[PDB]
Amino acid sequence: DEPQLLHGAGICKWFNVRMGFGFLSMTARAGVALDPPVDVFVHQSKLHMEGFRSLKEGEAVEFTFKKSAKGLESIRVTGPGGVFCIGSERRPKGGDRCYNCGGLDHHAKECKLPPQPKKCHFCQSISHMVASCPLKAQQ
Template sequence: MENPNLSSEPAAEGGARNSSSPGTAPATPGEECGCVRLGKCKWFNVAKGWGFLTPNDGGQEVFVHQSVIQMAGFRSLGEQEEVEFECQRTARGLEATRVSGRQGDDCHGSTYRPRINRKTRRMRCYNCGEFANHIASECAIGPQPKRCHRCRSEDHLHADCPQRSAAVTRTSRRSKSIASDEAAEAAEANSAAP
């Protein structure tokens, strides 16, 4: 779906453009570019970093990218936020070159922030043995004696844990029996073939 405000078609005869809203007179091309204009943010996508401004003088909507917004930190615009801006005509339509709050102040920005898809990784603290959100050097508990992280016994370490060796032998027996079953089936298949 193509936005009619971003089309590169030439203006209608006489230099007038078709206005998307009836009753508003479009601004002349000289008024649209190169001067400071006032307007409101029609909408802004904080995840993608772009949106559109509606000029107060009733001209064509103006594309705005987050890189031209004057504010500290995460740059965005809130819906219906009043701004002043400068723009230029590009092949795709009008594009803002500078966007700020009224009288050149910083913009307020949107209250929404884009969602960050971060996989949370479970980390084991080798001091307290917990799966937590810290590592041993940042552990709130003081230094602990060496101990098994599986059963927390100070008699042995994780590599020598009797619980671990029982689990390993069960797994290794199971994998050995599966491998021997597969070998027996392969031998039967070879002997049955003429």
């Protein structure tokens, strides 16, 4: 008997918006840091966010995944702490998100979820703030 459902964290490795899928690079599996990082499939239907769903390369994610015949596959994908994903830089309203949950219809003062860790304004990482964002720097 061995695990069928696992928690993972990492970043979006790439995503094709038109096709609606891509891969995550998993940097931690069940709380264990991995080297090298491993690819986990992600389909648009599993993205936790409001409206047309996407990811951008480099955004911070957590997810639940399983092993399917084709390979590791995400079952649901969120930002850190279970908040909404960011999406493509072309996403309508995507530049005006609640600081706390990433939602599109309110601001942090009105947020109905409890205070979350501070996420980078550009990539949602909880390990840096935007003044030190390497994703923003190589963009």
